[PDB]
C-alpha cells in the first residue's frame, strides 16, 4: 500500500449493505512501518502413526504411500 | 507530568533475563529528561 509518514491510527471494516449503517466494524490498530525485510512463511503439516516399537527404532504408517 | 518522546526496552541485570519496557519522558516544568517503567505487561500498547 502507499506509505504514511505520520503513523496514523487505523480502522478496519467490511461493507455490508444489509446493516442499518451499511458497515461492519472488525478491528482497529496502527500503521507501524514500511519494511520489506519482513518474511512470512506459510506452513503445512504432514502426520503419521507410529505402531511398532523397538529399543532404538520406530516404524511409521500413513504419512507416505510410495 | 511529562511528554513521551520514544519507547524503549531495557535488558535486566544478570542473573535475571528479560527485556523490560520503558519510555523516555521530558518533564513539562523543567525540560529535564527521564526514563520511566510501564507496569503490567501489555499495558505498553496504551502509550504512544
Amino acid at each position: 500500500a502507499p506509505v504514511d509518514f505520520t503513523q496514523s491510527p487505523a480502522i478496519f471494516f467490511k461493507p455490508s449493505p444489509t446493516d442499518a449503517k451499511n458497515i461492519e466494524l472488525i478491528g482497529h490498530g496502527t500503521f507501524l512501518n514500511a519494511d520489506h525485510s519482513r518474511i512470512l512463511a506459510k506452513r503445512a503439516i504432514l502426520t503419521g502413526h507410529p505402531f511398532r516399537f523397538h529399543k532404538t527404532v520406530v516404524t511409521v504408517r500413513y504419512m507416505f504411500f510410495r | 507530568k511529562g511528554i513521551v518522546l520514544e519507547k524503549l526496552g531495557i535488558e535486566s541485570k544478570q542473573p535475571n533475563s528479560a527485556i523490560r519496557k520503558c519510555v523516555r519522558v521530558q518533564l513539562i516544568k523543567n525540560g529535564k529528561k527521564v526514563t520511566a517503567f510501564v507496569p503490567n505487561d501489555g499495558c505498553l500498547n496504551f502509550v504512544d
Binding site: - | 535488558e11 544478570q14 542473573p15 533475563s17 527485556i19
Partner: protein, 239 residues
C-alpha cells in the same frame, strides 16, 4: 557456530560450576540459541568436529579403524588432551617430507586433532606377485632408503605392510628415529634385509643397486653423507 566456538574457547578458563555457563560465556537469544542447536571424550569429539565443518565438501564414507586412530580425500582422527598433540606432530612431519622430493601422500589440512590427506590409488605391496618390471623396482626401493639416511632419518619398519603400489608410495612412518641413534646400523640392516627377503621369496629376483649396477646393494657406511639434517627439524630420537 560462535555460540559453540566460544563455548569451547571458554573451556580453557579452568570441574565446571553452573555459573560458568551464565557469566563466563557472553544475553537474550544467545542464552537460547545454544539450546536450539545443543538440543540436536564424546563432546570433545561429537561437537569438536565443528571446526573442520566450518573451515573446510563431502562427508565421504567409512574406510578403516585402528587401535589408536580412525580413518574415513582421506581423513585421519586420533584417540583426552594428548590426541591434539599427536596429530600436530604427524601433520608437520609429513608436510616437511613432502616439501622434499619424497613420495609420500600430500597433506592438505590439519585442525583440532584431525588431519586430511590425499587418497592413494594403489593396492598393498604384500599381495603383489606379477609386476612387469621387478628389476628396476628393486633398485628404486633400495635407493629410497639411502635418501632418508642422507637426510638424517631411519624408518623403523620399511616393509610390505606399509608400502603401496616408480609407482610406489610410502603410507606411514611409525616410530622413526634419527641417524644419530646408537642402534642406527642395526635397524638399517633390517630394512635392507627385509626387502631382500621379499624379492627372493616371492619374486625370485635376487647410481643404483643390483644387476646392471656396479654395487650390489647399499651398506650403512656407504652413501651416507649427512646431507640435510632433517632430524633436527623434528627431534625424532637421539638428539
Amino acid at each position: 557456530t560462535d555460540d559453540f566456538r566460544v563455548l569451547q574457547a571458554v573451556e580453557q578458563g579452568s570441574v565446571v560450576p553452573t555459573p560458568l555457563i551464565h557469566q563466563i560465556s557472553g544475553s537474550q537469544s544467545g542464552t537460547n540459541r545454544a539450546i536450539s542447536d545443543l538440543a540436536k571424550y564424546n563432546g570433545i569429539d561429537y561437537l569438536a568436529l565443528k571446526t573442520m565443518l566450518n573451515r573446510d565438501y563431502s562427508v565421504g564414507n567409512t574406510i578403516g579403524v585402528g587401535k589408536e586412530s580412525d580413518i574415513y580425500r582421506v581423513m585421519k582422527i586420533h584417540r583426552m588432551h594428548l590426541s591434539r598433540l599427536a596429530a600436530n606432530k604427524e601433520y608437520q612431519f609429513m608436510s616437511m617430507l613432502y616439501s622434499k622430493g619424497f613420495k609420500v601422500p600430500e597433506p592438505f589440512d590439519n585442525s583440532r586433532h584431525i588431519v586430511v590427506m590425499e587418497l592413494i590409488e594403489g593396492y598393498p605391496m604384500r599381495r603383489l606377485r606379477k609386476h612387469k618390471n621387478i628389476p628396476k623396482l628393486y633398485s628404486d626401493l633400495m635407493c629410497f632408503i639411502v635418501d632418508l639416511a642422507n637426510s638424517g632419518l631411519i624408518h623403523c619398519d620399511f616393509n610390505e605392510f606399509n608400502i603401496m603400489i616408480c609407482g610406489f608410495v610410502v603410507i606411514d612412518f611409525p616410530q622413526c628415529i634419527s641417524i644419530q641413534h646408537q642402534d642406527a646400523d642395526y635397524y638399517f640392516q633390517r630394512d635392507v634385509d627385509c626387502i631382500r627377503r621379499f624379492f627372493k621369496k616371492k619374486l625370485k629376483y635376487e647410481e643404483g643397486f643390483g644387476d646392471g649396477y656396479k654395487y650390489a646393494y647399499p651398506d650403512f657406511k656407504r652413501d651416507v653423507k649427512r646431507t640435510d639434517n632433517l632430524d633436527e627439524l623434528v627431534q625424532a630420537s637421539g638428539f
